[PDB]
Amino acid sequence: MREIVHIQGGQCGNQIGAKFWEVISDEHGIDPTGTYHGDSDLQLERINVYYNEATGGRYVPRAILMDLEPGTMDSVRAGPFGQLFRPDNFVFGQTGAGNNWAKGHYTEGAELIDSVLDVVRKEAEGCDCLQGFQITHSLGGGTGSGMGTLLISKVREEYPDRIMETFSVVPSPKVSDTVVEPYNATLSVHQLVENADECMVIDNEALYDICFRTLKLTTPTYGDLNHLVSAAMSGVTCCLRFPGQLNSDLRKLAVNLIPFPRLHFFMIGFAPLTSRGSQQYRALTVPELTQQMFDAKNMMCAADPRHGRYLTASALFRGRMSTKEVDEQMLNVQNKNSSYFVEWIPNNIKSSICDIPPKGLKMAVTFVGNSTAIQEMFKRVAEQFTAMFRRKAFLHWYTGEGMDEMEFTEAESNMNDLVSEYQQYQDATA
């Protein structure tokens, strides 16, 4: 019932999903061998959402793994919970994109897209009734940022009515891992804005800041960052998979969070996060949860929200508690922070509750907010883009594979516009 398929493109997305599936299997009581060994009956009532049933009682995730090089799939196949992935869905190239969006989107991606399109189409007809699709990828890598959004355009062409998530890792200048980030970043986001029903921005420098500050652990790793991202992943669809007093699905979020068709860029967060030094000192209560999930340092994004006003926000609580107290901190935090909320949309806070908490924690919360502070990433990325582009540096490699300067010009103009109308409503008054 109302399932979603899960597909990865690019090594970043593959690594995210690799242990996203681990988290999902753990919370559903699924072993690395596909055999259910949970204890509660509710663990089995809604497993078709992510797992297909195979002969012998085993379950296989409905995930399609895709990349233009075989190394990352070769590694993830031997990774933990790698046996669940069915060998057929592995679609790999033979050359690699060279972090070049042209090789990732026109020459190699266009010819390679046919097999993955066939597989995703068959998988789509496989499920009973489809909710939509959700993506995990990075805009900073050539193969991902190009051919993933290519696939996005194709799939949105064929299924106009479904809802789509895109959890995207944006580049930042603090931790910069590649010299050509602005080019492929703007090229990917220009196409993504026109078709993305919802975009979830994730910042790795923000991840480092969180894992440094909130938990006080000395040496975090890509695994820990993936853990935070996976918790954010599971928090969204906990409510669709488990019962609750106020059930709200992906279409619920789409209705309640998007005022206008071009305003679909979101920043997310997860709570609670505690050190191993203070977990049993700290007493977890609803006010503590809410003050953490509205904290500026708990957000997965580097953009500071107090430089803008929230257009809207939504929160999903997990665990056993009544709803009226939740409502009262919502109203109190809306009252004392009325300066940071837009004044012509009262009651811009969505609340949802699920009665099954995550394993090991009796209460949890996931926050997703559409705010007027997102313009910072776009302006700084555009500034980097024009800094690279006014001297035509790194340009001949793109223009030698079907690119011209006109596409870059249109992408830059479109992004500047998107910034303009995204910040226009910040100054709007009733």
Binding site: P32, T33, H37, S40, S75, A78, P80, T219
Partner: protein
Amino acid sequence: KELDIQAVIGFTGKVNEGLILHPDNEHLIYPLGSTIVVRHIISRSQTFLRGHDNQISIITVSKTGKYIASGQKTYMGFQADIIIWDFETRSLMHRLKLHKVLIQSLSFCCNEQYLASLGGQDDKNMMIVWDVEQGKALYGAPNRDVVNQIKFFNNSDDKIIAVLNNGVQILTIDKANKKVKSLDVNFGNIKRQYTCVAIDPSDTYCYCGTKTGDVFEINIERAIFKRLGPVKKLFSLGIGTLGLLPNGDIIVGAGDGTVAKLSIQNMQVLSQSEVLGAVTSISFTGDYTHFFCGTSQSNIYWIDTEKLNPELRNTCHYERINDIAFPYNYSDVFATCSTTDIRVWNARNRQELLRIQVPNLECYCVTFMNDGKSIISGWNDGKIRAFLPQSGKLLYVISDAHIHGVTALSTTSDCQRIVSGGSEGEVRVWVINKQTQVMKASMKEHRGRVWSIQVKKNNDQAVSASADGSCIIWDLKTFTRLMCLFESTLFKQVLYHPEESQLLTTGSDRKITYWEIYDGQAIRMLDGSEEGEVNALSITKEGEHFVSGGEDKLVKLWGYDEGIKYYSGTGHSGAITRLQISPDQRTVVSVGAEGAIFIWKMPEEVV
């Protein structure tokens, strides 16, 4: 003086490799909640080792049957203590104080002179070496990532193995310099998580288990691995324990509970079998046949080799007995509440009789019914359930009786009604009838959770004791006349005196207090340890003596008429909570919150 104990029902399968068959045999050692026990096998004798404060975490023994090492987990503020017991003397030969919270593993060399201890995840995974003759910390090693276990080599004790969470590490220790050298065994594109390890007698190869369920094979002379393990098939919850036959055959324990053997060939099972509970301990007997298995659910199994058929030797309680009961004027059988599943046991022979299982609920105050009717229990959700005696099917369920779980129950003799108590001071009366179950409670208010309700012989009068500090006596006919007895502490068991007017009551204070409905106190017994909370009491049909038990390990019975203790009870571990006396009164039974069950021979001269 001291009171005899005839039987003990206790075992803790939570700690890995807990069950150990002492080399030269005839001796079997296992940890109780906080004390170690050793048992002679040909004879029926046993001995207690009590030199600990908290729950034991690790048990290890040397080769050739020399001294034993035991380690426990403590609070963050203090430090865990490692206790070395000399065997054949049953004496604490050494005590060592280091590490922050808990110790993960202990290792003995082939020679008995050296020791290795491993701290918990807290203290930042500190590895320490010790000298047995004099407690000395020659040197140590801190490492960032967690290491689940460490083992010494069979020969060449200078080389040791550590199954770190990321992978395998080989450590070299030299006498010339206190330094320790670390080499990390490299795996090509492998991120398996590793818990258990074993070493072949030739010390060439080591077999290490995985959380996925495939056993890896690594030579020590190099960082190269050879084999992943059983191909095309896994064990579905990781690898619990490893054992090596003289053939090189590898006996493996799976997390789900599974015993299988792999030849030194293609990793294919020659024989496979299924065993209840998660596997926790495997001990090979001398000549390596018919070994012992210990589950995570406190079950002891006798598993044959090369033809894997599981045979259940004996079963023990899982954890945390909550209460005990006898049938009315019957002592052959007694029932125990558990964390999840009620059990019934025979007094003469303590083999299990029948279990009634509930998935995720705690029971409280299981109450028997005369005329052989159903057994009644209350659960966390607030529901009350009745089950038939021979077979565990329910007669009926009462739903939403109390908001936060029924705590105590009491039955009238003529059995048409039940009285029940909730946590939030609600005492209710229900009229049972074969057709239907109804309630006519007063919904009387009573602040704290009620721990005990008693009904007199004529069955009209019924007293209930709260946590708040009030023991209220109810007429049960008009549900009124609220005169309630006052003292300021957390109450516990209350009892009528059989065919008298006095109430023998207890509370959190270290005093057993004789009361009456007229605030008449015969004596204030004041049976106090340093921080004891006397909790369980029982009375003989003739008021000669009463049995009393605190939170402390000691349990004692006192003469009713005069305030002098006769005899005493020891050998318990943890907090003793319930003390009953059989209707025949030939024994006294006690249930310990750490999984132990004790039956005591009541002294002869109290008849």
